[PDB]
Amino acid sequence: SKGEELFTGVVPILVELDGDVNGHKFSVSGEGEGDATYGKLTLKFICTTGKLPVPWPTLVTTFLQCFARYPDHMKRHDFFKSAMPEGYVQERTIFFKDDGNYKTRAEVKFEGDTLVNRIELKGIDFKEDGNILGHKLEYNYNSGNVYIMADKQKNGIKVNFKIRHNIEDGSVQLADHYQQNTPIGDGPVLLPDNHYLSYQSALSKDPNEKRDHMVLLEFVTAAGI
């Protein structure tokens, strides 16, 4: 495909997010590389406005499916790569069980040769003393699958999944994700059969970085076909 060629090597990533969580304005910037060949993502984020009002783990999913590693036999299902270099719109609604919910809009594309992801995030209905606002979430993350199906009508895709965040007392916090992807151009794309993505992430810190931030490593491989 058209965009397949762009992911042949290691790609520079640039991430910019603007959010407001219950009137808690903030900004985050990340940089890192991408190696679609191994389904590898390596990023670092800094909350440029100070202290991040919410828990890092809550942004993980928000913070590049085009870096998925598609087995050769599944190449014809890669929608992300197909949408490039034009890019696509990734829209999201993330509901936290018994709490607020994030609404996301992001544009992912190429700028010159840097893969860019701009996000506008809006979050409301959070309990000030909730798990989120009250930062009860442990700095860790579990493995999982993201389910993918076509969106013929829309010439896009619909993805649905759930994340389970650990709470400091042993409990679990639910995050149900709703997701639509549409391509930015009027270009042709790849509409896939149903499959999913297998995710593995590890969060970490930068011993030397004083600023509020998050180092995130992630492996993603496509399956179910």
Swiss-Prot record:
Changing residue 38 to N: In EBFP1.2; shifts the excitation and emission spectra to shorter wavelengths and increases quantum yields compared to BFP. Changing residue 194 to S: In EBFP1.2; shifts the excitation and emission spectra to shorter wavelengths and increases quantum yields compared to BFP. Pfam families: GFP (PF01353). Changing residue 202 to K: Abolishes the tendency to dimerize and leads to monomeric fluorescent proteins. Changing residue 45 to L: In mut3.3; shifts fluorescence lifetime from 3.03 to 1.88 ns. In R10-3; matures to the red-emitting state with excitation and emission maxima at 555 and 585 nm, respectively. Contains a chromophore consisting of modified amino acid residues. Maturation of the chromophore requires nothing other than molecular oxygen. Changing residue 159 to A: In GFPB; leads to enhanced fluorescence at 37 degrees Celsius. Keywords: Chromophore, Luminescence, Photoprotein. InterPro entries: GFP, GFP-related, Green_fluorescent_prot. GO terms for biological process: bioluminescence; generation of precursor metabolites and energy. The keyword Cell division does not apply. The keyword Isomerase does not apply. Monomer. Energy-transfer acceptor. Its role is to transduce the blue chemiluminescence of the protein aequorin into green fluorescent light by energy transfer. Fluoresces in vivo upon receiving energy from the Ca(2+)-activated photoprotein aequorin. Belongs to the GFP family. This is Green fluorescent protein. It comes from Aequorea victoria.
